[PDB]
């Protein structure tokens, strides 16, 4: 459905609504409260962000500094960059049930990206983990400043989905 | 393959079921009030954020 | 950049280099009213959303039916002005005079709020909160995060910014 | 006169003395890293951030 543009030249964007959208809710699990969780992700997505990297650096500050893996804002922003980029392909894992885009165009390679480059691969599996927990703290109701604007209810199967998109994330870098 | 262009799905979603419609934005057919959009759009650089995390990496937000 | 504003053609004005270097010439503290600018714009979001929140938190009357920023439409509206106000104290800075915000803000805008039923009270709330998080960093009591500044003394840029939310909150008092 | 057209000075404000360069971006004369930019543009409605408040008024934040 989305497919299309995933592999578009240009990525312009797809709209499904109406019937088309009952449809999609149908073909995948727990649709609506899905859609609540999608929203989760990508309404929140600048602070999971920071609050990863940020985490991954106060617990090793050894990053920030001379030789570090984010020292000066260049590599600091591509950090933050990155760690959006994977939460956007975690996003749309969860939107349509399944990991094959985020294994493709987002894992294919990645580690070897980072080997080449030197990103620090116990940097990564920190941000990774908190972001993981970020995710699943929103929609499980354990965030403490925010929460979901939902119906009151249990997300824990699209908690345990959404981890499983992460730990392949995790596992790709290890 | 991982094309190293920085292009990720952007997904949106939209729960307009108190009727308030602004100009411009019915891009699908359909009247319950619900939404989804996804584009292809390379993530961008930015700076202001990374300055802030530069800065302030080692104050513990949000109760976390 | 007055003529990107006397005009609503809507195009940006951009000032670098020596021509910038002079600007700041024009202005007291150049250099330490651009962090400020900075931080009011790049924290605008956050500012915004805790002075509303504020506004509702100490009368929580605002979003049962019947209060003024119930319903998503109304709650938003509210959110959009707060931040057209801040911008405008944003630009009174930037500038270091109310002349803009006095003219295209402020004129008129009393009025409309007491037609549509705006209620003062809750605008001076949310008014006042914006102000404290404001000179709150600028003057390095932000809790959460701080400006990416030298140190130093910001107490008269933020006794000036004060002045121009003072003028709000005259205006619409 | 305020014209009710939600329209505000919207200000940005370059530090860019890293060296750090976007392609497409040098809009003025300039090599020291410092620019202004300022443009009039129409304030949006934000209806997720109307909905978040609406549910989270009541919860402090920033030590505030
Ligand atoms: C998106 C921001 C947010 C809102 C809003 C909210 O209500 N909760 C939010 C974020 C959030 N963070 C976590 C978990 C962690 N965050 C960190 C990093 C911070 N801890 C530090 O020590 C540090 C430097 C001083 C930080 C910055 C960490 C380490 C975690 C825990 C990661 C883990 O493996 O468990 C959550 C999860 C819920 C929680 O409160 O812990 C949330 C929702
Ligand atoms: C932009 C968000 C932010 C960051 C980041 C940061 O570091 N500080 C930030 C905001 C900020 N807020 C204030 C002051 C106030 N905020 C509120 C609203 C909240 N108080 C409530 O009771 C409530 C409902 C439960 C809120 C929501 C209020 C009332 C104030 C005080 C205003 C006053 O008259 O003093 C500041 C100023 C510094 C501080 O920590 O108080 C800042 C920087
Ligand atoms: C974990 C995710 C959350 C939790 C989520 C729940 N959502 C529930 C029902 C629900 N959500 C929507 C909106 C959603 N559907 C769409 O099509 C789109 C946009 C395209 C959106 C944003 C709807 C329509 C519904 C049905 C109920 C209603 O409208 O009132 C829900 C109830 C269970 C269920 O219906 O499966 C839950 C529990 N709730 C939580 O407390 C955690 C934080
Ligand atoms: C390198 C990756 C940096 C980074 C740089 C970016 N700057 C972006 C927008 C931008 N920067 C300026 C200032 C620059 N232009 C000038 O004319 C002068 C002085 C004469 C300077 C110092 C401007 C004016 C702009 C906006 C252009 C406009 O409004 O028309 C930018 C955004 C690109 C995008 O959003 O896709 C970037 C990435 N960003 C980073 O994180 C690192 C540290
Ligand atoms: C309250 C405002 C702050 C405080 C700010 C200070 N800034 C100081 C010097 C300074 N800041 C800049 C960047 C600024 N100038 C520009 O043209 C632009 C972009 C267009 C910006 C973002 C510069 C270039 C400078 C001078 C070079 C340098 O000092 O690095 C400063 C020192 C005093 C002074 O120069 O007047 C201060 C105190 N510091 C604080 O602790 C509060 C939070
Ligand atoms: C009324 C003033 C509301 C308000 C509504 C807004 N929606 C905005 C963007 C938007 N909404 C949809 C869903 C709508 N279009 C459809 O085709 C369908 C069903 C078939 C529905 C339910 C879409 C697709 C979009 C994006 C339009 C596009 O991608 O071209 C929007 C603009 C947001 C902005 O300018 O930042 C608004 C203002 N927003 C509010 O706060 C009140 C409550
Ligand atoms: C953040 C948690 C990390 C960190 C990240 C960095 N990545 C850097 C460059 C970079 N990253 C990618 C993968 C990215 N591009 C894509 O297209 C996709 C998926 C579609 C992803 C996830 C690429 C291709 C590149 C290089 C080419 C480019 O940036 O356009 C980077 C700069 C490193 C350097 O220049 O030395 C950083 C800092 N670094 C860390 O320490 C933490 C753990
Ligand atoms: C927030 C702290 C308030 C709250 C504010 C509301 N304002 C509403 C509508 C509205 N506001 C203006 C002034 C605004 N437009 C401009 O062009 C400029 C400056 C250039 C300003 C500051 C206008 C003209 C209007 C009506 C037209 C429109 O919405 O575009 C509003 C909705 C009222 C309505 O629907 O009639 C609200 C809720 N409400 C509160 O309770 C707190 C105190």
Same mark, same amino acid.
């Given at each position: 459905?989305?497919?299309?543009?995933?592999?578009?030249?240009?990525?312009?964007?797809?709209?499904?609504?109406?019937?088309?959208?009952?449809?999609?809710?149908?073909?995948?699990?727990? &649709?609506?409260?899905?859609?609540?969780?999608?929203?989760?992700?990508?309404?929140?997505?600048?602070?999971?962000?920071?609050?990863?990297?940020?985490?991954?650096?106060?617990?090793?500050?050894?990053?920030?500094?001379?030789?570090?893996?984010?020292?000066?804002?260049?590599?600091?922003?591509?950090?933050?960059?990155?760690?959006?980029?994977?939460?956007?392909?975690?996003?749309?894992?969860?939107?349509?049930?399944?990991?094959?885009?985020?294994?493709?165009?987002?894992?294919?390679?990645?580690?070897?990206?980072?080997?080449?480059?030197?990103?620090?691969?116990?940097?990564?599996?920190?941000?990774?983990?908190?972001?993981?927990?970020?995710?699943?703290?929103?929609?499980?109701?354990?965030?403490?400043?925010?929460?979901?604007?939902?119906?009151?209810?249990?997300?824990?199967?699209?908690?345990?989905?959404? &981890?499983?998109?992460?730990?392949?994330?995790?596992?790709?870098?290890? | 393959?991982?094309?190293?262009?920085?292009?990720?799905?952007?997904?949106?979603?939209?729960?307009?079921?108190?009727?308030?419609?602004?100009?411009?934005?019915?891009?699908?057919?359909?009247?319950?009030?619900?939404?989804?959009?996804?584009?292809?759009?390379?993530?961008?650089? #930015?700076?202001?954020?990374?300055?802030?995390?530069?800065? #302030?990496?080692?104050?513990?937000?949000?109760?976390?």
């Amino acid at each position: 459905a989305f497919s299309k543009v995933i592999t578009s030249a240009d990525g312009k964007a797809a709209y499904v609504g109406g019937a088309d959208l009952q449809a999609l809710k149908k073909f995948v699990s727990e &649709g609506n409260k899905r859609m609540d969780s999608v929203n989760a992700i990508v309404s929140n997505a600048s602070c999971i962000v920071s609050d990863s990297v940020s985490g991954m650096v106060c617990e090793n500050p050894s990053l920030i500094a001379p030789n570090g893996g984010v020292y000066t804002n260049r590599k600091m922003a591509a950090c933050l960059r990155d760690a959006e980029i994977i939460l956007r392909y975690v996003s749309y894992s969860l939107l349509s049930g399944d990991s094959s885009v985020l294994e493709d165009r987002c894992l294919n390679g990645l580690k070897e990206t980072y080997a080449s480059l030197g990103v620090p691969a116990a940097g990564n599996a920190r941000t990774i983990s908190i972001m993981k927990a970020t995710v699943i703290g929103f929609i499980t109701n354990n965030s403490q400043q925010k929460k979901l604007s939902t119906p009151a209810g249990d997300c824990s199967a699209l908690a345990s989905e959404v &981890g499983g998109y992460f730990d392949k994330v995790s596992s790709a870098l290890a | 393959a991982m094309k190293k262009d920085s292009k990720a799905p952007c997904v949106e979603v939209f729960d307009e079921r108190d009727g308030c419609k602004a100009a411009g934005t019915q891009k699908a057919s359909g009247d319950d009030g619900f939404c989804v959009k996804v584009s292809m759009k390379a993530i961008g650089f #930015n700076a202001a954020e990374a300055a802030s995390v530069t800065k #302030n990496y080692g104050i513990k937000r949000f109760g976390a």
